[PDB]
């Protein structure tokens, strides 16, 4: 597992979301904190994939690998 300490995170969530979380906990036989940790970890993982994608786009832009908008339109049949 992890060899890190942890902190208590708290936030307000609408009752429907909490009810859906509780129902998922019942069906999967794992408690609320397990699923909340999965939700946060997976969210942050997705956000790092967005950073990775943006970075690849910045690399193109800084190398001058840029196309004119009108040319995008022409390839897609718009102008």
């Amino acid at each position: 597992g992890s060899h890190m300490m942890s902190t208590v995170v708290s936030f307000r969530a609408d009752d429907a979301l909490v009810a859906a979380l509780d129902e998922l906990a019942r069906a999967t036989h794992r408690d609320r904190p397990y699923h909340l940790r999965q939700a946060l970890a997976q969210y942050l993982e997705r956000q790092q994939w967005q950073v990775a994608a943006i970075d690849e786009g910045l690399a193109d832009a800084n190398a001058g690998r840029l196309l004119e908008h009108i040319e995008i339109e022409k390839r897609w049949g718009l102008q």
């Binding site: 943006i54 786009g57 910045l58 193109d60 840029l66 908008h69 995008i72 897609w76």
Partner: protein, 92 residues
């Protein structure tokens, strides 16, 4: 001001077309991509170049598109607005 797309953002559109052609066929996949391209176009106007919300990456804003689960990260650089990617995202 000039609106430009990175090589990667242009390839993204081609990949998005292929993703939707197998789900909804070529006519509707084409319309999906054309919709995305037309949603990006107003970033050419300075009045819109503060749209979207700060991305995780410094100096890059992200435009969350309508209808299709994609976001367009962009930045202003000199006399250019640069469309950096068309990224798939999850939206609630």
């Amino acid at each position: 001001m000039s609106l430009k797309w990175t090589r990667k953002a242009a390839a993204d559109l081609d990949a998005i077309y292929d993703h939707y052609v197998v789900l909804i066929g070529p006519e509707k996949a084409l319309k999906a991509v054309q919709d995305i391209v037309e949603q990006v176009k107003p970033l050419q106007q300075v009045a819109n170049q503060g749209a979207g919300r700060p991305s995780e990456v410094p100096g890059v804003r992200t435009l969350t598109l309508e209808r299709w689960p994609f976001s367009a990260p962009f930045r202003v650089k000199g006399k250019e607005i640069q469309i950096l990617r068309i990224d798939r995202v999850e939206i609630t």
